[PDB]
């Protein structure tokens, strides 16, 4: 009863070391399909999936140490990256040239996330706050505060009005952008989170903690709709499908599963990587999956609708 799943392309060695994040954006109205991947290097290589294959387009780099998170925007041609280098320099993605540079150390930013309208570029600090910078408008207007521990993941509901933040030690915080007041704090897991994602229409929040479970909470209350346990090690990223029916989760056991939220069961598992898989994403009208892994490879899968 399952569909016909399978690989479409396999880049042999994208970078020279581990690949730590990936972002897929079909930003422009025509067929762009721009893939931005960052590694344990300075390289922020910008690939393009043109017709049936990936062609390297930019090899831009300005970093001093490895980049820990990269992000791309759907409205403008732009990209942002942060690293252990204590800089959040954001590129141009059109000329392959740096636009800006923000000073913030490992005590001021860990991971990136753009706004739905690509304006604010929030990041998570060390002392617990979330710092919201301003693209094209300066630096560090304001920071939402949760009195907790190191904060790892930052997500936006793709209608605004909600911000979610996982942390070391487990607790999860949901803010509303409208007023900036903590609505309610979930207690979630007992080990670091390091991944969160809302769903399109922003009524379902999917976490992925460090112990192997995948809570499926429900937003605007604290109801949880189940725990998905099917991995054998840490879970490092979760990407939610454009239609509210599946999502993809990559674990540190060298296997990329794809679950579905309707019946909370695993349809298909991919056993194709050889080392930890640090990043998975969908594309536009979700029918293909990108998976960058710790071993230097970029896999592109085929998930029929």
């Amino acid at each position: 009863m399952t569909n016909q799943y399978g690989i479409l392309f396999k880049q042999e060695q994208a970078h020279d070391d581990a690949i730590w994040s990936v972002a897929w954006g079909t930003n422009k109205k025509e067929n762009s399909e721009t893939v931005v991947t960052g590694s344990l290097d300075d390289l922020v290589k910008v690939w393009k999936w043109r017709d049936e294959r990936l062609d390297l387009q930019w090899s831009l780099e300005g970093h001093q140490l490895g980049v820990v998170s990269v992000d791309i925007s759907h409205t403008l041609p732009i990209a942002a990256s942060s690293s252990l280098d204590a800089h959040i320099r954001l590129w141009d993605l059109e000329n392959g040239k740096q636009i800006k540079s923000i000073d913030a150390g490992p005590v001021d930013a860990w991971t990136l996330a753009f706004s739905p309208d690509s304006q604010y570029l929030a990041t998570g600090t060390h002392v617990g706050k979330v710092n919201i910078f301003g693209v094209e408008s300066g630096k560090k207007e304001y920071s939402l505060d949760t009195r907790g521990k190191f904060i790892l993941s930052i997500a936006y509901s793709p209608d605004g009005k909600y911000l979610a933040s996982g942390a070391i030690d487990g607790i999860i915080n949901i803010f509303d952008i409208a007023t900036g007041k903590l609505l309610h704090t979930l207690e979630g897991h007992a080990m670091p989170i390091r991944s969160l994602t809302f769903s399109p229409d922003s009524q379902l929040l999917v976490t992925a903690s460090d112990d192997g479970y995948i809570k499926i909470y429900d937003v605007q209350h604290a109801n949880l709709a189940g725990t998905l346990s099917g991995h054998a090690s840490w879970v490092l990223n979760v990407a939610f499908c454009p239609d509210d029916t599946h999502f993809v989760s990559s674990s540190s056991d060298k296997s990329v599963k794809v679950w579905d939220v309707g019946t909370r069961t695993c349809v298909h598992t991919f056993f194709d990587h050889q080392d930890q898989v640090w990043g998975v994403k969908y594309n536009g009208n979700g029918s293909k999956i990108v998976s960058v892994g710790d071993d230097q490879e970029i896999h592109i899968y085929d998930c029929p609708i």
Partner: protein
């Protein structure tokens, strides 16, 4: 011929559609569309033709095409929205109805559609246990229905649907329903009103009555009867009354009987009458059984009636016949939940073996309440019994079906549904405690306390208090724990023990000792006695007074059987004192008769610490290597071996790196520490690798930093790795990189240190080292001003500490003494005084001697190096000794270079190099010997022999070989031999060089 007859096709199609001849009408209208496929009337009529007979998605597509052009028509858009709504996908229908409402405001069907869609989403929400969304949706639905009733208040469907919407909120855990009804509904139309549960149901009954008044049909009669039943059920279930709801139930029976007699051929009415008739308040079972039988007879495909008969028989002790009825019901419909729940209950009653599996299947199907409670109870009971964990019942069920998390989720849904039952809360707390979700378990126990405060309290309230207080004490909030433990009779072992530990956590050690003594009085189950003695020893120790703790632990040892816990505490107590005698005896005794311990890491750590106490400091690594050989699995042992080699005897750098890598490979969650230790070992090693990328120190430390960016060691390791990388790149002379980031890393180090519980000495050492390293890095890179301000601020914080002041001296004296300048004896005396003040740290002495050498103090610098060498040797350190020795040899050789008289420096060079070779095989030392020989009696044969030996044997660093090559080339050209010179040329060629051949070119044509 081809089209152009649409007006005829249309008439014949309408004539065939008005009569029941749908096939001919469909063909006619398709032909009409073929005539001209742009007239929206034809498309719309064809859609209506398809909608009259079966077809729904071809009518839907045709209606969409009709609506695509001329989008002003409200009817076409409404029909498209309605057809798409029919097949689910309610949100899109809501969006189009809202758009229509935005255009036109009086459109009654649009409001009716919006209300129906909201009600359907509310019912779907109630299928799951997301009650809050259901309440919100129902509030919005009532808003839309009253708005619709504002325009046309003669229609029946609007009132009926309003009553459905309001009365579908039964069993929604009151005190969760507050509905903001407004307007005509509450009689007179004033403002708004907030309704609670019972009032909402009463309004529902009123609305059904009003709807029924103007259209007397069977369906509304049955619905009104059901509403009255729900109202009576709610009134009884809250204990609000009894015997004053008789007339209400009679009214419900009257309505249902009216409905069934009105049309006695529909199973629904008979089934409703049967269900209501058997309510506890009426209790007329014969009528219920007759009604269910009539319902089954009326329409054969009826699972509901069969399962209701099964329930009726099962509650009246008829297990076999009820089982038969349930089997028939599931035979007619394999995915109806109630039959499965009944099967599970029957299996439980007769005491079968597959009751847990049946409850699990019921839980997996659709989340009903009764199965939820049954499954949670069975999981908790199975967890309690501690004779299970080999049975393949416990193992299979719990550890291969992930029973515990499923039970927790199920109990959360149940507790949100019911929330007036204490055992559910206690079970939820117990499971949450097993998941280490301590905060949620504490909340659960607190709510259980709130419910139970008016109970009997003998065995249901004190236990809840002890559990809540103990769990609260587990996670901070000591005062609240103490207060909770006060409000209980402190007469059982558990309460006294919990009180004692909470007191110990807060302080008040004497009080804790008293409480533990009182608990010690009342003891059975001798394990608890040994534990109480060990706790007494620990708590009294924390005050000091160690001798009484020691003798008390010996008293525990005198008991019939040791507990393997008191012995470990005794060994650690021995370690926390320098006695180091009782510790050996305790460890030997512990090893003697205890094998059931399954950690294998504490034993090695304790033995290693015992060896370290006596200052042996090399056996430690050897012993851990023995332990790792014994059990080649157990990553933890490999990681500890890596840590120890990093700390003690840091001359096995290669082995340590390999051990850390092996520890990292064999698992993933030991990644953090193993990567940290291998990075530190790489730092200690140097660059003794194949100059391979992707495996230098900076890479492993970066990987560790990504794994756990919380601890303070990784960031300091990052600072050290960056500095070492800078030095190596400087030697290779390609580019310095990673230049100015030290201040950020220092801030990260301090911020991370702030949140660790206590390793005080370790934190102080880490903070001081990070400060010193940052200052040195800033001085080296060239940002003198920032280093100076940092040192000044640090001294401004606290009175002087002789470490930072030396750093300030270093920062001050960099611009001067870089460029040649003469310094006055006052400055020299100040530097000498500060360095002597903060003595015992060889780097300071070496730096001062370098200052002397820079100004030019050859003998004074030699004396300072000699003192540093003596200090290093006395400390037992090893790197400092060789470093100082080689540096002193360099001093003597450099002063010799000027060909100065008082030929004593060559003796010093000889002595230093002989000692260095005595310790190791330092290539620099042998090169220094060669240089000294070359300067004194430049000569022909022996000097050339030594130089050629240095420059011809492999296994030497590039730079030293190059220097030796260059000097040997100069010597060989001095005593002319062209053959040997070309031999040198080819030797240079087979390697990479630029300068030796360049000198040969310079001197080939004098």
């Amino acid at each position: 011929s081809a089209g152009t007859a649409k007006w005829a096709w249309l008439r014949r199609g309408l004539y065939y559609l008005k009569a029941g001849q749908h096939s001919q009408a469909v063909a006619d209208l398709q032909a009409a569309l073929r005539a001209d496929p742009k007239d929206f009337n034809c498309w719309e009529s064809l859609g209506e033709a398809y909608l009259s007979r079966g077809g729904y998605t071809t009518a839907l597509k045709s209606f969409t095409k009709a609506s695509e052009l001329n989008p002003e028509s409200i009817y076409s858009v409404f029909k498209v929205a309605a057809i798409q709504q029919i097949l689910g996908k309610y949100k899109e229908a809501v969006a189009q109805y809202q758009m229509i409402i935005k255009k036109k405001e009086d459109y009654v069907p649009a409001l009716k559609g919006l209300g129906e869609c909201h009600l359907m989403m509310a019912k779907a929400a109630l299928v799951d246990y997301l009650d809050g969304k259901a309440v919100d949706y129902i509030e919005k639905a009532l808003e839309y229905f009253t708005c619709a009733l504002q325009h046309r208040a003669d229609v029946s469907c609007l009132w009926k649907l309003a009553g459905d919407a309001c009365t579908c909120l039964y069993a929604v855990a009151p005190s969760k329903v507050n509905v903001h009804v407004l307007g005509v509904l509450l009689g007179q139309k004033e403002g708004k009103q907030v309704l609670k549960k019972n009032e909402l149901l009463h309004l529902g009954g009123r609305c059904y009555g009003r709807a029924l008044k103007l259209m007397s049909t069977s369906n509304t009669w049955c619905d009104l009867g059901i509403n009255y039943y729900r109202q009576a059920q709610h009134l009884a279930e809250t204990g609000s009354n009894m015997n004053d709801l008789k007339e209400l139930l009679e009214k419900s029976l009257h309505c249902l009987k009216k409905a069934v007699r009105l049309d006695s051929n529909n199973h629904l009415y008979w089934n409703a009458l049967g269900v209501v008739a058997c309510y506890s308040g009426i209790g007329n079972y014969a009528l219920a059984q007759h009604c269910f039988i009539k319902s089954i007879q009326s329409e054969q495909i009826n699972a509901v009636a069969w399962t209701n008969l099964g329930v009726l028989y099962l509650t009246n002790e008829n297990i076999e016949q009820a089982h038969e009825a349930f089997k028939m019901a599931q035979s007619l419909d394999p995915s109806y939940l109630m039959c499965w729940i009944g099967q599970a209950l029957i299996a439980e009653a007769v005491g079968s073996y597959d009751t847990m599996d049946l409850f699990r299947h019921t839980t997996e199907l659709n989340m009903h309440t009764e199965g939820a409670l049954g499954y949670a109870y069975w999981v908790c009971t199975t967890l309690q019994d501690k004779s299970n964990r080999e049975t393949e019942l416990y193992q299979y069920n719990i550890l291969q079906m992930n029973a515990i998390p499923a039970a927790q989720v199920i109990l959360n849904k149940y507790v949100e549904r019911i929330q007036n039952y204490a055992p559910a809360f206690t079970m939820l707390g117990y499971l949450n405690e097993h998941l280490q979700l301590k905060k949620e378990a504490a909340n659960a126990y607190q709510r259980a306390i709130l419910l139970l405060q008016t109970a009997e309290d003998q065995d249901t309230y004190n236990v809840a208090i002890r559990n809540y207080g103990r769990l609260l004490c587990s996670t901070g909030e000591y005062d609240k724990a103490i207060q909770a433990f006060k409000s209980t009779p402190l007469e059982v072992l558990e309460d006294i023990i919990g009180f004692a530990l909470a007191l110990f956590m807060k302080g008040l050690y004497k009080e804790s000792s008293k409480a533990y003594e009182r608990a010690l009085s009342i003891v059975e189950s001798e394990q608890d006695k040994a534990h109480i003695l060990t706790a007494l020893a620990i708590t009294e120790y924390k005050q000091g007074k160690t001798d009484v703790a020691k003798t008390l632990l010996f008293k525990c040892s005198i008991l019939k059987e040791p507990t393997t816990e008191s012995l470990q505490a005794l060994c650690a107590l021995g370690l926390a004192m320098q006695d180091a005698t009782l510790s050996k005896a305790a460890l030997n005794e512990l090893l003697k008769h205890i094998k059931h311990k399954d950690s294998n890491y504490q034993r090695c750590l304790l033995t290693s610490a015992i060896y370290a106490l006596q200052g042996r400091s090399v056996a430690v690594q050897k012993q851990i290597s023995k332990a790792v050989h014994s059990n080649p699995g157990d990553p933890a042992l490999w990681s500890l071996l890596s840590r120890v080699v990093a700390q003690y005897a840091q001359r096995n750098a290669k082995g340590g790196v390999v051990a850390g890598n092996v520890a990292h490979i064999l698992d993933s969650n030991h990644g953090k520490k193993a990567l940290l230790y291998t990075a530190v070992n790489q730092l200690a090693m140097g660059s003794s690798s194949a100059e391979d990328e992707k495996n230098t120190a900076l890479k492993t430390i970066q990987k560790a930093a990504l794994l756990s960016p919380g601890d303070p060691a990784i960031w300091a390791g990052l600072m050290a790795a960056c500095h070492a990388d800078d030095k190596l790149a400087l030697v290779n002379n390609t580019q310095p990189k990673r230049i100015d980031l030290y201040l950020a890393l220092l801030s990260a180090v301090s911020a991370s240190i702030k949140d660790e519980k206590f390793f005080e000495n370790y934190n102080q050492s880490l903070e001081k080292w990070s400060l010193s390293q940052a200052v040195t890095g800033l001085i080296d890179t060239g940002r003198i001003s920032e280093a100076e301000t940092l040192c000044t601020k640090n001294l401004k914080s606290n009175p002087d500490q002789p470490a930072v002041i030396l750093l300030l001296r270093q920062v001050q004296c960099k611009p001067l003494l870089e460029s040649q300048k003469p310094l006055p004896d006052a400055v020299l005396e100040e530097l000498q005084k500060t360095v002597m003040s903060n003595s015992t740290s060889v780097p300071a002495w070496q730096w001062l001697a370098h200052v002397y050498q820079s100004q030019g103090m050859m003998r004074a610098a030699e004396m300072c190096y000699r003192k540093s060498l003596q200090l290093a040797s006395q400390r037992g350190s090893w790197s400092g000794k060789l470093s100082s020795l080689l540096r002193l040899a360099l001093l003597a050789l450099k002063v010799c270079m000027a060909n100065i008289s008082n030929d004593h420096w060559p003796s010093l060079v000889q002595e230093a190099t002989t000692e260095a070779l005595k310790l190791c095989f330092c290539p620099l030392a042998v090169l220094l010997q060669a240089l000294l020989q070359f300067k004194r009696k430049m000569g022909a044969r022996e000097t050339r022999r030594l130089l050629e030996r240095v420059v011809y044997q492999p296994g030497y660093p590039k730079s030293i070989a190059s220097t030796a090559r260059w000097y040997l080339l100069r010597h060989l050209y001095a005593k002319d031999d062209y053959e040997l010179i070309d031999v040198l040329v080819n030797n240079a060629k087979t390697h990479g060089d630029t300068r030796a051949l360049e000198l040969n070119q310079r001197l080939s044509s004098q």
